[PDB]
Coordinates of all heavy atoms in Angstrom, one line a residue:
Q11 N 5.0 -6.0 9.6 CA 5.2 -6.3 11.0 C 3.9 -6.6 11.7 O 2.8 -6.2 11.3 CB 5.9 -5.1 11.7 CG 7.4 -5.0 11.4 CD 8.0 -3.8 11.9 OE1 7.9 -3.3 13.0 NE2 8.6 -3.0 10.9
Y12 N 4.0 -7.4 12.8 CA 2.8 -7.8 13.5 C 3.1 -7.9 15.0 O 4.1 -7.4 15.4 CB 2.4 -9.3 12.9 CG 3.4 -10.3 13.2 CD1 3.3 -11.2 14.3 CD2 4.5 -10.5 12.4 CE1 4.2 -12.1 14.6 CE2 5.4 -11.5 12.6 CZ 5.3 -12.3 13.7 OH 6.3 -13.3 13.9
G13 N 2.2 -8.4 15.8 CA 2.3 -8.4 17.3 C 1.4 -7.5 18.1 O 0.4 -7.0 17.5
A14 N 1.7 -7.4 19.3 CA 0.8 -6.7 20.3 C 0.6 -5.2 19.7 O 1.5 -4.6 19.3 CB 1.5 -6.7 21.7
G15 N -0.7 -4.8 19.8 CA -1.0 -3.5 19.3 C -1.6 -3.4 18.0 O -2.1 -2.3 17.6
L16 N -1.6 -4.4 17.1 CA -2.1 -4.3 15.8 C -3.6 -4.2 15.8 O -4.3 -4.8 16.6 CB -1.6 -5.5 15.0 CG -1.9 -5.5 13.5 CD1 -1.0 -4.5 12.9 CD2 -1.4 -6.9 13.0
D17 N -4.2 -3.2 15.1 CA -5.6 -3.1 15.1 C -6.4 -3.7 14.0 O -7.5 -4.2 14.2 CB -6.0 -1.6 15.0 CG -5.7 -0.8 16.3 OD1 -6.5 -0.8 17.2 OD2 -4.6 -0.1 16.4
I18 N -5.8 -3.8 12.8 CA -6.5 -4.1 11.6 C -5.4 -4.3 10.5 O -4.4 -3.8 10.6 CB -7.5 -2.9 11.3 CG1 -8.7 -3.3 10.4 CG2 -6.8 -1.6 10.8 CD1 -9.9 -2.3 10.4
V19 N -5.9 -4.9 9.4 CA -5.1 -5.0 8.2 C -5.9 -4.7 6.9 O -7.0 -4.6 6.9 CB -4.4 -6.4 8.0 CG1 -3.4 -6.7 9.1 CG2 -5.5 -7.6 8.0
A20 N -5.1 -4.4 5.9 CA -5.6 -4.0 4.6 C -4.6 -4.4 3.5 O -3.4 -4.8 3.7 CB -5.9 -2.5 4.5
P21 N -5.1 -4.4 2.3 CA -4.2 -4.8 1.2 C -3.0 -4.0 1.1 O -3.0 -2.7 1.2 CB -5.1 -4.4 -0.1 CG -6.5 -4.7 0.4 CD -6.5 -4.2 1.8
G22 N -1.9 -4.6 0.9 CA -0.6 -3.9 0.8 C 0.4 -4.5 -0.1 O 1.7 -4.1 0.0
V23 N 0.0 -5.4 -1.0 CA 0.9 -6.0 -2.0 C 0.4 -5.6 -3.4 O -0.7 -5.8 -3.7 CB 1.0 -7.5 -1.8 CG1 1.7 -8.2 -2.9 CG2 1.6 -7.8 -0.4
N24 N 1.3 -5.2 -4.3 CA 1.0 -4.8 -5.6 C -0.2 -3.8 -5.7 O -1.2 -4.1 -6.4 CB 0.6 -6.1 -6.4 CG 0.4 -5.8 -7.9 OD1 -0.4 -6.5 -8.6 ND2 1.1 -4.8 -8.5
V25 N 0.0 -2.8 -4.9 CA -1.1 -1.7 -4.8 C -0.8 -0.6 -5.8 O 0.2 0.0 -5.7 CB -1.2 -1.2 -3.5 CG1 -2.2 0.0 -3.4 CG2 -1.7 -2.2 -2.5
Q26 N -1.7 -0.5 -6.8 CA -1.4 0.5 -7.9 C -2.1 1.8 -7.4 O -3.2 1.8 -6.9 CB -2.0 0.2 -9.2 CG -1.7 1.3 -10.3 CD -2.1 0.9 -11.6 OE1 -3.3 0.8 -12.0 NE2 -1.1 0.6 -12.5
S27 N -1.4 2.9 -7.6 CA -1.9 4.2 -7.2 C -1.2 5.3 -8.1 O -0.3 5.0 -8.9 CB -1.7 4.4 -5.7 OG -2.4 5.6 -5.3
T28 N -1.6 6.6 -7.8 CA -1.0 7.8 -8.4 C 0.5 7.9 -8.0 O 0.9 7.6 -6.9 CB -1.8 9.0 -7.8 OG1 -2.0 8.9 -6.5 CG2 -3.1 9.0 -8.5
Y29 N 1.2 8.5 -9.0 CA 2.6 8.7 -8.8 C 3.0 10.0 -9.5 O 2.3 10.5 -10.5 CB 3.5 7.6 -9.4 CG 4.6 7.2 -8.5 CD1 4.4 6.6 -7.3 CD2 6.0 7.4 -8.9 CE1 5.4 6.2 -6.4 CE2 7.0 6.9 -8.1 CZ 6.7 6.3 -6.8 OH 7.6 5.9 -5.9
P30 N 4.0 10.8 -9.0 CA 4.4 12.1 -9.6 C 4.8 11.8 -11.1 O 5.1 10.7 -11.5 CB 5.5 12.5 -8.8 CG 5.4 11.9 -7.5 CD 4.8 10.5 -7.8
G31 N 4.6 12.9 -11.9 CA 4.7 12.8 -13.4 C 3.5 12.3 -14.1 O 3.6 11.7 -15.2
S32 N 2.4 12.5 -13.5 CA 1.1 12.2 -14.1 C 1.0 10.8 -14.4 O 0.4 10.4 -15.5 CB 0.8 13.1 -15.3 OG 0.9 14.5 -14.9
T33 N 1.5 9.8 -13.6 CA 1.5 8.5 -13.9 C 1.0 7.6 -12.8 O 0.4 8.2 -11.8 CB 2.9 8.0 -14.5 OG1 2.7 6.8 -15.0 CG2 3.9 8.0 -13.4
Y34 N 1.2 6.3 -12.8 CA 0.7 5.3 -11.8 C 1.7 4.3 -11.6 O 2.6 4.0 -12.5 CB -0.7 4.8 -12.3 CG -1.7 5.8 -12.7 CD1 -1.8 6.4 -13.9 CD2 -2.6 6.3 -11.8 CE1 -2.6 7.4 -14.2 CE2 -3.5 7.3 -12.0 CZ -3.5 7.8 -13.2 OH -4.4 8.9 -13.5
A35 N 1.7 3.6 -10.4 CA 2.7 2.6 -10.1 C 2.2 1.7 -9.0 O 1.4 2.2 -8.2 CB 4.0 3.4 -9.7
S36 N 2.8 0.5 -8.9 CA 2.4 -0.4 -7.9 C 3.5 -0.5 -6.8 O 4.7 -0.5 -7.2 CB 2.0 -1.7 -8.5 OG 0.9 -1.5 -9.3

């Protein structure tokens, strides 16, 4: 979403990180 009030952007596609069950996911 975009428009009035947006401050900044950052990566948000295919973002790999920690997940429950001692694993990782995008």
Side-chain angles (χ1 to χ4, degrees):
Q11 280 170 56
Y12 65 95
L16 189 64
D17 290 278
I18 200 165
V19 295
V23 172
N24 188 208
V25 175
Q26 183 173 69
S27 191
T28 44
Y29 223 69
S32 304
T33 194
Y34 305 86
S36 303

